[PDB]
Subunit: 195 residues, 2 copies
């Protein structure tokens, strides 16, 4: 084993406590931009999961998309939310999160360890159409939230850096249309504020 915490009720409860730490990991991107009361990582995954339900693609297993949305950032309960500004090399971030996912999932019975760990791997390696879709949900959810913070602050355009970072990251036809609509509305508000 790694540790010897067993696969009974005590470890299931501890798994749930670790998952609960996600409520107390603020999303670092917003922290570093001085957003007041920023969302948690679980807030972020929650809306992604709903987005997987309501943004259509008949070619995808949406049950799997929902599960991927709910599991993909789970390592952050241990690792925290590493942002670009933290300058952690991709390989190191991978190593930390993989080791964390091993620690987290080993608290579960073998069948559930396997499922959750394999969901995480599917997302990390972007090995499926479902994974690639969910990654675009993540980026879309982020820029939507950016626009929402700008609106709440009455500072249109303040969080432009987030939009710039999503350049050429979108290709799913439904998400592309959602993003175009979002950027149009936002840009309308920016222009309206300018006059």
């Amino acid at each position: 084993s790694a540790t010897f915490s067993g696969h009974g009720a005590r470890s299931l409860l501890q798994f749930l406590r670790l998952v609960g730490q996600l409520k107390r990991v603020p999303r670092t991107g917003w922290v570093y931009r001085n957003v007041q009361r920023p969302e948690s990582v679980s807030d972020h995954m929650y809306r992604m999961a709903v987005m997987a339900m309501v943004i259509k693609d008949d070619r995808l297993n949406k049950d799997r998309c929902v599960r991927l949305a709910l599991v993909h950032d789970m390592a952050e309960c241990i690792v925290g939310d590493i942002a670009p500004a933290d300058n952690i090399p991709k390989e190191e971030k991978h190593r930390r999160e993989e080791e964390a996912m091993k620690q987290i999932t080993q608290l579960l019975p073998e069948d559930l360890r396997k499922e959750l760990y394999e969901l995480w791997e599917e997302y990390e390696t972007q090995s499926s159409a479902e994974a690639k879709f969910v990654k675009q949900l993540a980026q879309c959810e982020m820029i939507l939230q950016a626009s929402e913070y700008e609106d709440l602050e009455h500072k249109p355009g303040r969080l432009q850096d987030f939009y710039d970072s999503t350049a050429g990251k979108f290709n799913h036809p439904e998400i592309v249309q959602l993003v175009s609509e979002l950027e149009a509305e936002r840009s309308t508000n920016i222009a309206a504020a300018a006059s």
Copy 2:
């Protein structure tokens, strides 16, 4: 279309800014959001065993059941809102929220909410037990974080006898034993 979908998602996003009222009224610092609560419930649906249940349906129930709160807010027992009035408000809200979706999705999400509201399936009953379990777990977590063991006992008292799912009963028993050991320790 995309515009209405965006409007729907902004409404859903409001859940991030609805604090769970039970904790607010107990002076918890930085209390969890309603979406925080549904998030962990959804993960619980995945990891708490029941081979008789449609688990992905349980996941969706967890993610939809409190969704009306984006318009209604999180009504707590201390708010003294009659059951019928709360139901009326949340039903009206869900109709408003879901009407922003295309037909098939409007129907699905509304029917999920309704299934949980009316507790009309084994899945709904399971998810209601997840909700209560998630709540008392969070109560003990705040007690631990505050270093005020037992402070939120009222939440435990409110769930007394409300658990009957065998796996959830096991988890709850473990939780209460660990917590009571902590309280007993503090009491000495």
